[PDB]
Amino acid sequence: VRMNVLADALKCINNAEKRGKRQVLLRPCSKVIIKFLTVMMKHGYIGEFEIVDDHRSGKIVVNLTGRLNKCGVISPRFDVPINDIEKWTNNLLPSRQFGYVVLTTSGGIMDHEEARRKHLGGKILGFFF
Amino acid sequence: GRMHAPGKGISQSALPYRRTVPSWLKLNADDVKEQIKKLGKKGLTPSKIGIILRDSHGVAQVRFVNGNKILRIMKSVGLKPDIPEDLYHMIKKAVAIRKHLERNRKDKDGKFRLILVESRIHRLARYYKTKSVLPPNWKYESSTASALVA
Amino acid sequence: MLADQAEARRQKVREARKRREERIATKKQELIALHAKEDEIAAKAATAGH
Amino acid sequence: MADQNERAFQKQFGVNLNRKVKPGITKKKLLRRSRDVGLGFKTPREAIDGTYIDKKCPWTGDVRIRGRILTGVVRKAKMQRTIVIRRDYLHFVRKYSRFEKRHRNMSVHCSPVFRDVEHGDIVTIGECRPLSKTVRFNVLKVSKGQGAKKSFKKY
Amino acid sequence: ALESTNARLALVMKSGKYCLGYKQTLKTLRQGKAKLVLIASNTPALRKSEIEYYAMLAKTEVQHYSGTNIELGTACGKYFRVCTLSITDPGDSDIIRSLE
Amino acid sequence: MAIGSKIIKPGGSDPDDFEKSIAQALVELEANSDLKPYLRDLHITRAREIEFGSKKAVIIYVPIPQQKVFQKIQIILVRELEKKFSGKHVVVIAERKILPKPTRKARNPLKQKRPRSRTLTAVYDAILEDLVFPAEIVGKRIRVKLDGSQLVKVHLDKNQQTTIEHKVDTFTSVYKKLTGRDVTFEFPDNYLNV
Amino acid sequence: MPLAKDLLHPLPAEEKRKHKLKRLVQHPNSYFMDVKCPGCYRITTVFSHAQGVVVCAGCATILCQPTGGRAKLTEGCSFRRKPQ
RNA sequence: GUAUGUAAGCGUAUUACCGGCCGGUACUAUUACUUU
């Protein structure tokens, strides 16, 4: 059963560049997922992604540029306040230099350093580098 | 998938994209609203009501010519009976268990198959118990399997 | 006594709750042809002569 | 419910039939001084013109509602003027930052103006004085009480 | 007998009228307002005899229901036994022209 | 001498003159000897004449309880009006009664408890089918541009492709003027066997 | 190419033999046809995989062949792959 | 020239009133979550 519609969508992206699949056939077009792929394009991690919509769910095509290493996911959505976001950096990132964990607070979906300027505590969905 | 089974197998219909075609169909939603008053009054189940309109006339989809689901098309002219249709096939399939296994026992393969449709009632009927399509204090009893279907 | 509170619905007061539509669409299907009598009376008066 | 069935007599203490001599004629349409909680909660209309006695009633007894105020769900109602409600919450562990489904159970008292409360209705709760060995609360309002699926609908 | 003949009764219960007993069957057999008569195999023998002599004069048709009174009595939504039945009005069902 | 509104504009609005000028054009569309059993009661509510810089695009507010009969006449509504209102492209566009919940601190819904045909999808779905009316849409695809921007791919195989293809440039304007989504329209000749 | 750049625009004929379900959109191979049985004249529309015995109101010549797949009528049929 | 990360207008309970855009007052399905 499709338990979490978030995480299963993430991993097949990581199961593309290893054999070098420059494209991704992807399902099933949720609006929380559409709020997420542009964050990759907000730092230029993938290629062009497009979404056809059948009148059941929709499905996603994703091209890839090949700059990724691994996108990940913590499960389920742990609740994280402001004063303890830094714990989820060092356990999830290679360093403070690059990479981005991505949570979502009551204001929306963002980067952690974006959230470190927006200052509103929220829930982890995933991470990538 | 395939709950009571080993198989991963998958078989279903395939609905098309648009929601109006057949537009060439001169038939409206109104004569089929009489056809359910004509055919569905003869005791037919909501599935096989929807299969005679496909082959004969043939409307591809009544959901495209009319908005309501077909039980509501049963209800809005008054054809929803007391019992939901799909368990009514299961309980008939359940009552054939107490016709084969009443005399021809030792069929513990067949006696396995009682535990399915009793469970395939009791998980299923728990859903329809909630949805207020038949009231609670509806307990399936073993002698009732004859008279619920007949 | 609780069973019969809002029960002007069952036998006659289904249609005497559906009488809101029975006094509208039954008459006004013809009155629009009566509203358009300027090109209904003069329409068949032209085809009868020509 | 009651036709004053008691081996003694029951009456709300603090009122008397004063018949002829009176400052004016203060009929008040019934000789029953029904108070109100005034904490935003509307009074039930049946409480003012009630015949029930209920010395432990928060509206009509020697009670003023105190403490805090909460909501929840009710399970059992067999015992007299008293229902069995249930509340839910979570707990925060150290080892996992994870949660659990534990619960408490507080028995509570009812005035009969909330007659016919059943499983599993939804009932808010407010605190008062101790009644008898457990009961320090009182029912405030049948707020929702609606199970739209299994409990709250006729058949 | 068959499962399929049982379904022909299955729309009479929503539609058609009924006569249950010797007395309710033989009453409409006197006026002849009935059409189809049902006989289960465990009918007593003179009762298995006596009904069908009317049918030689009332010109009606009967059937030999191969089940028992316990199932035929529950093949009609009831729970008490059925040994004979006459459907005096086929409401919506198709026993009006069907042979077995 | 020149009758205008009050036959078709109820129950909508009496402004304006450009909605009034087509109402004098509507009464001379009654003289086509075939639509006169229908348009005597086919009413309008509003209109709009928004230009694409040089040419105008005419918006027609159908009230949609008559969209089952507005469709089969719509082949002849656009053609005779275009030669009378050249070069201003006309299309019926039913503005809906959008039921929102306002973007506030979870602002209160009631009344109008929002059936599901009355959400922001109607800004697309209830609008896109009426703009490309005779197109018979087969596929909508969502192209996502670089800076959070979007293109939508609207597909039509051959279903009267040879009469409305000169309006798809006009169709790109008014959809961005009514909804805002940037649109392109998809030709392909291949009868894709399904 | 296994590392292909175009999935939005595939070649048409391989999609026609891909599946009834696994395509880029959802549409079955089935359709409707307008069979005239050759011993008669009357027009009748029917599904491809009809799964149901059909005859006309007065013209019951053949009109179908009972199967699990599509109704394969040999020399007793006349129809078209067309929405009517 | 450019950028957009800024607020208002504009596809609408951007709440009702008295005030100088601007104070006071009519006056809101919940939780869990997080904010101070």
UniProtKB/Swiss-Prot annotation, chain A:
Pfam entry (one): Ribosomal_S8
Record GO cellular component, one term: cytosolic ribosome
Swiss-Prot/TrEMBL keywords: Ribonucleoprotein, Ribosomal protein
Keyword Cytoplasm annotated: no
A molecular-function term among this protein's GO annotations: structural constituent of ribosome
One GO process term, biological-process aspect: cytoplasmic translation
Family according to the record: Belongs to the universal ribosomal protein uS8 family.
Name used for this protein in its record: Small ribosomal subunit protein uS8A
Organism annotation: Drosophila melanogaster
Swiss-Prot record, chain B:
KW Thylakoid (keyword) present: no
Main location: cytoplasm
Metal-binding keyword on record: no
InterPro entries recorded: Ribosomal_uS15 (IPR000589), Ribosomal_uS15_arc_euk (IPR023029), Ribosomal_uS15_N (IPR012606), uS15_NS1_RNA-bd_sf (IPR009068)
Gene Ontology biological process terms, A to Z: cytoplasmic translation; ribosomal small subunit biogenesis
Domain of life: Eukaryota
Pfam families listed in its UniProt record: Ribosomal_S13_N, Ribosomal_S15
Disulfide links within the chain: none
Subunit structure: Component of the small ribosomal subunit. Part of the small subunit (SSU) processome, composed of more than 70 proteins and the RNA chaperone small nucleolar RNA (snoRNA) U3.
Protein name stated in the entry: Small ribosomal subunit protein uS15
Species of origin: Drosophila melanogaster
Curated annotation (Swiss-Prot), chain D:
A Pfam family of this chain: Ribosomal_S17_N
PROSITE patterns assigned: RIBOSOMAL_S17 (PS00056)
Entry-annotated residues carrying N-acetylalanine: A2
UniProt signal peptide: none
Record-level Gene Ontology MF annotations: rRNA binding; structural constituent of ribosome
Cellular component annotations (GO), alphabetically ordered: cytoplasm; cytosolic ribosome; cytosolic small ribosomal subunit; nucleolus
Gene Ontology BP terms: cytoplasmic translation
Superkingdom field: Eukaryota
Keywords on record: Acetylation, Ribonucleoprotein, Ribosomal protein, RNA-binding, rRNA-binding
CDD domains: Ribosomal_uS17 (cd00364)
Key word Ribonucleoprotein present: yes
Family membership: Belongs to the universal ribosomal protein uS17 family.
Record-linked PANTHER family: 40S RIBOSOMAL PROTEIN S11 FAMILY MEMBER (PTHR10744), 40S RIBOSOMAL PROTEIN S11-RELATED (PTHR10744:SF9)
Protein name as annotated: Small ribosomal subunit protein uS17
Gene name of the record: RpS11
Curated annotation (Swiss-Prot), chain F:
GO MF annotation: an example: structural constituent of ribosome
Highest taxon above the source species: Eukaryota
InterPro entries: Ribosomal_eS7, Ribosomal_eS7_CS
GO cellular component: cytosolic ribosome; cytosolic small ribosomal subunit; nucleus; small-subunit processome
Signal peptide: none
Keywords: Ribonucleoprotein, Ribosomal protein
GO terms (BP aspect): cytoplasmic translation; ribosomal small subunit biogenesis; rRNA processing
PANTHER family on file: 40S RIBOSOMAL PROTEIN S7 (PTHR11278), SMALL RIBOSOMAL SUBUNIT PROTEIN ES7 (PTHR11278:SF0)
Sequence similarity: Belongs to the eukaryotic ribosomal protein eS7 family.
UniProt name for this protein: Small ribosomal subunit protein eS7
